[PDB]
């Protein structure tokens, strides 16, 4: 069947070649870029103790949570540098973090395979864990809250799982990946999501149907972190192959290959600005790269850190970009 | 101050959060996290039983072993429920104090060689040094001295090797035990460059100095980490 299913996977590469009329770089040859823009660190968020594995923004655009691998989830007042909460975790190796759109909840997704959903807005002042989502048989590489009582979570098992915090059990288990799914990004319409994996394939998923809608290949290495383009019809994935790839939903191709030849380090984070014109990756050379997501130019470097940039996020209002790295510090850019 | 009243205590909470974090820093910086990378059929599952019982969930990926020896806390972190692809969960341990890569020297090992070769020349596990910690010597000498049917046809460089200068053991076992040591060091000192130095040992189920073999060779990393800050070493 391996030679029999190869032509059907070759049916995808020529159905995508049938739509391959003109590239995004050929389309956007007549649109003026953002140019070499200065972007400066506004708040250095000192206070962690270890490598900041992943941060996430509130949808309130101000509350920032970050996962550092010291056993500390810290919720930041990012506007005033204040630490809104610090959460002593049980899993000291937390790989990822997810702030709820409601803002009541936060997830640490440990290396220990629990998505400890912490309830921030308790009647108690303590941030107790509401549902340590045990399961998922692999390092919890990403998680993204859909609602207050529904989270989708990525695993080191080659399988993403949609959970229910009020129950405590994975309602859906998205099991299309052949390699460890390293990240996960929910759609703006929160009815799809995307998941980039160590199988070099980013798989589009339906959250309700549980089905692999499209599998986006084209990356040469393990897709380290992923984010949706904010109109929900595209996403850029960032692999270890140092080449970010903007794929298009309902098109099954890669549009822009954000490849600079002087960059060989892995793209360990990806975020999209509110326009989706300014895609700002978090590379492993201790700097970001605010790519023009249409012109595919470098268009801005965020060199604020000493160690590899593990996590970018642009706010829902698009105003800040927090940036955590493998030091104790989160730089907030503009 | 120009801060409001509920923002005056939003800092006074945040300062008391930092006061907890500067208390958690003393707990973090005075405790030495140790990755523990024994493979299948190795001795990892009993060394985390040995180091725990000497001194202090159904699919949990990390088992934390908190052992203190000479009154300094260590956290051995063997990696349980994660699958065989170590590519990405091993990056998370770039700021550990050591990597206790436990080896089945009894079995035949090239998988343990090619694992240690990848753990050494990894871009994130370079500048952190493996405590090589060769376990199961009671059955390693049984595979050479007592049994002798486990001869080294797997390893063609055994015929061109003899124990150079090394410490009641048989001379054919001590040649073998210091070849298993020498097989890793041919993949350790090749791409070490002084940033991280492998600290090998020999262990068993009845070792009982296994945690002291960590701490005395974990001192030898933090010493060598600080000597590299003085450009001394």
């Amino acid at each position: 069947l391996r030679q029999e299913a190869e032509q059907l996977k070759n049916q995808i590469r020529d159905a995508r070649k049938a739509c391959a009329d003109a590239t995004l770089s050929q389309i956007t040859n007549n649109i003026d870029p953002v140019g070499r823009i200065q972007m400066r660190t506004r708040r250095t968020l000192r206070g962690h103790l270890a490598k900041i594995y992943a941060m996430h923004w509130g949808t309130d655009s101000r509350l920032l949570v970050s996962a550092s691998q010291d056993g500390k989830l810290i919720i930041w007042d990012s506007y005033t540098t204040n630490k809104v909460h610090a959460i002593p975790l049980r899993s000291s190796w937390v790989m990822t973090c997810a702030y709820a759109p409601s803002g009541n909840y936060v997830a640490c997704g440990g290396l220990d395979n629990i998505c400890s959903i912490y309830n921030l807005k308790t009647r108690e002042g303590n941030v107790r864990v509401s549902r340590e989502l045990a399961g998922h048989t692999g390092y919890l590489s990403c998680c993204r809250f859909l609602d207050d009582n529904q989270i989708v979570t990525s695993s080191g098992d080659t399988t993403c799982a949609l959970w229910d915090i009020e129950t405590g059990q994975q309602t859906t288990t998205f099991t299309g990946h052949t390699g460890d799914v390293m990240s996960l990004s929910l759609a703006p319409d929160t009815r799809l999501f995307v998941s980039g994996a160590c199988d070099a394939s980013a798989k589009l998923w339906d959250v309700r149907e549980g089905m692999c809608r499209q599998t986006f290949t084209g990356h040469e290495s393990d897709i380290n972190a992923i984010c949706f383009f904010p109109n929900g019809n595209a996403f850029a994935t960032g692999s270890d192959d140092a080449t970010c790839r903007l794929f298009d939903l309902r098109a099954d191709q890669e549009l822009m290959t954000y490849s600079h030849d002087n960059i060989i380090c892995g793209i360990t984070s990806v975020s999209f600005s509110k326009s989706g014109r300014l895609l700002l990756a978090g590379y492993d050379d201790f700097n970001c790269n605010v790519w023009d997501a249409l012109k595919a130019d470098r268009a801005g470097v965020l060199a604020g850190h000493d160690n590899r940039v593990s996590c970018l996020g642009v706010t829902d209002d698009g105003m800040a970009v927090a940036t955590g790295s493998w030091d104790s510090f989160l730089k907030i850019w503009n | 101050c120009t801060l409001s009243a509920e923002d005056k205590a939003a800092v006074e909470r945040s300062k008391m959060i930092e006061k907890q974090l500067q208390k958690d820093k003393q707990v973090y910086r005075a405790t030495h996290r140790l990755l523990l990378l024994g493979a299948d059929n190795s001795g990892k599952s009993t060394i985390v039983k040995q180091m725990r019982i000497y001194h202090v969930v159904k699919t949990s990926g990390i088992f934390e072993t908190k052992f203190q020896v000479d009154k300094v806390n260590f956290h051995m972190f063997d990696v349980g429920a994660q699958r065989d692809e170590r590519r990405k969960w091993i990056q998370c341990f770039n700021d550990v104090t050591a990597i206790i890569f436990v080896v089945d020297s009894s079995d035949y090992l090239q998988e343990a060689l090619n694992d240690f070769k990848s753990i050494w020349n990894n871009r994130w596990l370079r500048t952190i040094s493996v405590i090589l910690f060769l376990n199961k010597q009671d059955l390693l000498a049984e595979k050479v001295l007592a049994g002798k049917s486990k001869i080294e046809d797997y390893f063609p460089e055994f015929a061109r090797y003899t124990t150079p200068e090394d410490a009641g053991e048989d001379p054919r076992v001590t040649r073998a035990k210091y070849f298993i040591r020498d097989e890793f060091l041919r993949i350790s000192t090749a791409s070490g460059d002084g940033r991280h130095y492998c600290y090998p040992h020999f262990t068993c189920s009845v070792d009982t100095e296994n945690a002291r073999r960590i701490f005395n060779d974990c001192r030898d990393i933090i010493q060598r980490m600080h000597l590299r800050q003085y450009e001394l070493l």
Partner: nanobody
Amino acid sequence: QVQLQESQPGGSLRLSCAASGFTFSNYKMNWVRQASDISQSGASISYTVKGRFTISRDNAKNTLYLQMNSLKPEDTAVYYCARCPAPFTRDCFTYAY
């Protein structure tokens, strides 16, 4: 995708891995068996058996070569052209990808 298509003792049976869908120039594409690596553009080759089979490489032809000449009966197994996916880095890490 990352397409790696592989192609009585003592017979010189050499098999040609076909590396398509990626660069294969800055990828230290090793070999694994189912009963030994390379570097970028060759010139740093390691083995397990250390002289029986040799690992060539052709990045210009976009392919990996393995020349098994003096193979044992134990060497007759399923062969897989592995790929160390972290580029320009010797980080070669149920073995499925």
